[PDB]
Write a new protein. Structure first.
Lengths: 660, 660
């Protein structure tokens, strides 16, 4: 037992890519960890025996995540073990290699496939046919298909073109993926037998999700060439029949799962007429274009929205085995596992406290990885609403370091009851007084839970209270509780301030040393708070919003999201959109504020951070901005190790300067 | 079929490193194959199950050869999958990294050991104890132990020292290993438990062989500071008492094999009094009181000496199991596998026609690799003096290409009966007349046999007869037949000329279009042949000897192997040593001669080929020489693929110019 440190997340293990082979005898998953000297992450591939419950590491180089199961005996993963291709990729050629590793015979991995595109997600029809979404470029110089002098002329042209980015679509970049003007996520079928790659979705369609039955494919599709609209289309494609059928025309609904079920289709849709873009998705059944057939009115977002800075890579959030659809949802501060079969019968399969990040099922045996008992990620078997632990990767962190677990309680504010959390300082004493930090979960509609959060534990190990709550607009309590469109800064700001008052009386907190910090929406809330109260001695805005009208025209989602959340627009009721802009009050802000931001953060553009920083220094308030190159909006969760240290160290040194 | 071509050997597979696990269930071996793109060789690790009889490919990157079984489940091998250690070795650091490759439990190779020396061979006491022979430099800067300024001073000194070579001992280089002045093959003990690397042999000792039974080591020792002696010492060492015990003083005999058998030691040994350096070793037993007692009067070189250019790598030629010592002996054109128990009973186990390259024994099940039926290397199991073919690595070679198998016959010359071989041209017509090539096998005490030889089939596929024999001096018929000391160029030259006379009359060959080629000793005879007869219209002299005096002072074995073989010395009977030199008769040579030679060939220095070539050119005879860089004596058997293709091209183009 020793104190937890700022760089202790280097020792954390992150699990990902939970996957069964068809028989349910072996589980595959990836173990990601930090490589500090190389400023990257190692990727181990692991296997667990579902019958014997024995873990074993498979790969060892540290650059492998499992994509598929080749069959019930061999995993095939993408890697870079061919130098002559790695040099061809530097010249601009698109390629992806896959390697198969058998666990019964043994030995090592061998090369299996070569595909002349950059694969973004792979699904397997057989052993010699694959369904594929991959990187396609409307302006690509197909460098694999040139050989003579045009080869030489194209290599040069590719190099010169790096110096420019051309924009003619309204969503020209996408956070975590750079510029994407006229670049799409194209769907492909590949026949290794004949080495043939066939396009499915045409030149202007982003496959946002896709599922596959036998030789039939169900895929989400958003098509545009000037302006991506708010609606997504559903098409199908049988490989052999090579037919494309416009099922739902492209102007009505937005879809999320859209997988085949039995002989029809189960799909989560929504016409955004009632509660807007982020309206919870009800689930319908479609067949012969019978999209009206509703089987369940769902009032939750179908994902694990319990934020944390101890995750690296996702996994399976849904599954449709047989007749029942197994899907996740967030209800309070917790992730629920639920079913929804052909007769409409919903059942709750796991109501436990912690998070269920992603799961897998095979023979009506349910395995998942999650964070329970305020511990880091481990693999669990789920039987009759209680999880039995199986992996033990991070168990020593909680037995080597002093962790302060959150006190959870009900909190009533603005006519509803949500959750309120308080983390006591390390080596606590109700006789002495302590500083505090109010954390604001940065998703507009996400959730803080009883789940290990490293940045909160770091400040807990240095003598701070760390408090946080789920205000109006958060996930969990339906469209009603999460609807604050046009109310940004009113009831949501009231909820957090009401929660801050309640804590400041119950808990022995020095009211003169209280910090506030949050990312994304919380960064907006941090910018909003300092402009409306003087109750925080210091603040730490990160990946934040500041000027709604300029975020409108510079953000990957700004031109449609900002209107759905403020009911205003730079040209339609400008005063309202300007009213919910925190920079409007920056001439009242007296609280010293540190600004965290990234250069490639396109969910909240860099301009939003610079404005609030310039707005403070212009009025003489102490401020500081740390711009992070080569990182984006997910720096807190998935950024490079050293850059994650710098972000933590900057925020921490800001608190330590003013609050100690 | 189709015509075999010059480069068809690129498709050949070469087997090496046949080794059992302790329980006899699995035996490991390595496959090597040419890599023309990178001008190197790919090495894979394989496994066969002794009861399943199934071959399994274990590695696929092409840089791994199996060296040792950690246990019945796991094969260990050395590689360079650590980019940090690799760059340290470039600077001058010495390192060897060993990995582990589970068959029983599967996965990929994982790092098991790091050893701060450059290892030449490894053997196993137990899982955390290994016996070691490795490179040792008495002038090493010890870059592993250096830091700070002394480190950068050493990095520069090591870099500058690449421009020099210092010599102060009479063997200053070894063929296939570069300069070796003041550097030795040293024996070490490594305890993985505490990372302790303990020397066994002293700083000036070359360890030529070593064996272990349980916790006791037996090794062969040659020790010198200025002059390597012809005799080797026998030494033992225990890894618990750390006691070194001189078993045989280093000035009596030259031993070739020594190992533990039951409670005492078996040893091949000879004082070279009757037949000189190359005398066949008799096998003795060494009791507890260090008395040497004859066990079996062997009259064979205890090795497979059948020549071939389709081998890459080797394995065990000696084995001790229970009370029997299993060994190899080349008897005529073939290799025998025999046993020898502590009672002196010699059972013969395998007297088949082909060669036995190496073998391993476990539970009185005998497995070996060999070349039978004039096919390339395959794995065979030995059962009652007959072999069952398990592997099929090269089975299509003889079915894909037109192979002309030699016509074996008995040939009498000079009071003894040997073997004679004539390979017909492809698509042979008894109504036409063909050219022929006489191939003289390199090395005096070696053997030509009914074994697939690539360079001969290449010419038979181009309309050539290819003839060869085993003259007096070859291995197979005891010390008496091999003794040509002081007779170089007499009875052996007669034997070859008698064989050529017999063949060009019995077989339909144009006497006016006959060539001759040979390497090493065969290259000596080619230089001798052209200086004594006009019957060959062209010749090819490879890695040859032309001047015994010049060869005395520039050869890794020259200062003692020349005196033994010619009974002369540049200062004792110089007229004899000069009489046996082909350069003396170069002013009577009229035969156009191509000269193949390698720059790093230290068994036959570059001076030898340079002299005969200049002599023929001085007397106005057409000549040509191709010098090969980065290659040595072993160019024809193990050189880089492009350099083998170049040698085969130069030799094939010379005959075409003068024989067609």
């Amino acid at each position: 037992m020793e104190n937890l440190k700022l760089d202790s997340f280097l020792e954390y293990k992150f699990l990902s890519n939970l996957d069964f082979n068809p028989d349910g005898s072996n589980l595959a998953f990836s173990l990601s960890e930090a490589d500090l000297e190389n400023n990257s992450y190692k990727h181990f591939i692991y296997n667990l025996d579902t019958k014997n419950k024995e873990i074993k590491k498979l790969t060892h180089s540290g650059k492998e995540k499992n994509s598929l199961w080749l069959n019930n005996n061999t995993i095939l993963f993408s890697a870079d073990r061919d130098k002559d291709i790695e040099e061809k990729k530097k010249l601009g050629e698109t390629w992806t290699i896959f390697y198969a590793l058998d666990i019964k015979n043994g030995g090592e991995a061998y090369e299996y496939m070569k595909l002349p595109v950059n694969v973004t997600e792979i699904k397997i029809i057989d052993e010699n046919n694959f369904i594929l979404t991959a990187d396609f470029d409307n302006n690509s110089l197909n460098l694999n298909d040139l050989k003579g002098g045009e080869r030489e002329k194209a290599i040069k042209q590719i190099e010169e073109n790096k110096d420019y980015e051309v924009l003619d679509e309204i969503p020209f970049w996408s956070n975590g993926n750079g510029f994407r003007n006229k670049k799409r996520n194209r769907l492909y079928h590949f026949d290794k037998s004949n080495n043939k790659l066939t396009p499915i979705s045409d030149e202007y369609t982003n496959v946002e999700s896709f599922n596959i039955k036998e030789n039939k494919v169900i895929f989400v599709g958003r098509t545009y060439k000037d302006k991506q609209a708010l609606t997504a289309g559903l098409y199908t494609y049988d490989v052999k029949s090579n037919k494309l059928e416009i099922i739902i025309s492209d102007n009505l609904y937005d879809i999320s799962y859209a997988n085949f079920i039995e002989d029809k289709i189960i799909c989560a849709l929504s016409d955004m007429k009632e509660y807007g873009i982020n309206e919870n998705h009800k689930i319908y059944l479609i067949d012969s274009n019978k999209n009206i057939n509703l089987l369940y009115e769902n009032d939750t977002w179908l994902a694990c929205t319990v934020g944390s800075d101890c995750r690296l890579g996702g996994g399976k959030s849904f599954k449709v085995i047989g007749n029942k659809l197994y899907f996740l949802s967030t209800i309070a501060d917790s992730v629920h596992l639920s079913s929804l079969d052909t007769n409409g019968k919903v059942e709750i399969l796991s109501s436990e406290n912690g998070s269920i990040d992603f799961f897998d099922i095979a023979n009506n045996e349910i395995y998942y990885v999650g964070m329970r008992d305020y511990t880091l990620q481990e693999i669990y078997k789920l039987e009759n609403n209680s999880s039995i632990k199986l992996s033990s990767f991070n168990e020593e962190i909680n037995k080597k370091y002093k962790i302060s677990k959150p006190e959870v309680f009900d909190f009533i504010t603005n006519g509803d009851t949500t959750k309120g959390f308080v983390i006591y300082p390390i080596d606590y004493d109700k006789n002495k007084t302590y500083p505090a930090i109010l954390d604001i979960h940065g998703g507009p509609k996400t959730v803080y839970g009883d789940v290990y959060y490293h940045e909160m534990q770091v400040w807990a190990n240095m003598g701070y209270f760390v408090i946080f709550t789920n205000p109006h607009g958060s996930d969990g309590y339906g469209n009603k509780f999460a609807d604050i469109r046009g109310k940004y800064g009113t009831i949501d700001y009231e909820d957090l301030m009401n929660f801050t008052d309640y804590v400041l009386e119950k808990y022995p907190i020095d009211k003169s040393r209280v910090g506030v910090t949050g990312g994304s929406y919380g960064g907006y809330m941090t910018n909003w708070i300092i402009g409306h109260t003087d109750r925080f001695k210091c603040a730490a805005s990160q990946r934040s919003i500041s000027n709604w009208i300029s975020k409108f025209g510079t953000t990957d989602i700004g031109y449609y999201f900002n209107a759905d959340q403020n009911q205003a627009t730079p040209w339609i009721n400008h005063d309202k959109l300007w009213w919910h802009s925190p920079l409007k009050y920056a001439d009242k802000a007296k609280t010293p504020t540190l600004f965290i931001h990234s250069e490639e953060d396109y969910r909240c553009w860099l301009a939003e951070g610079l404005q609030m920083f310039t707005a403070l220094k212009y009025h003489g308030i102490e401020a500081r901005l740390c711009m992070f190159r080569g990182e984006n909006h997910e720096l807190s969760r998935s950024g490079k190790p050293k850059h994650r240290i710098r972000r933590l160290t900057e925020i921490t040194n800001w608190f330590e300067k003013y609050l100690k």
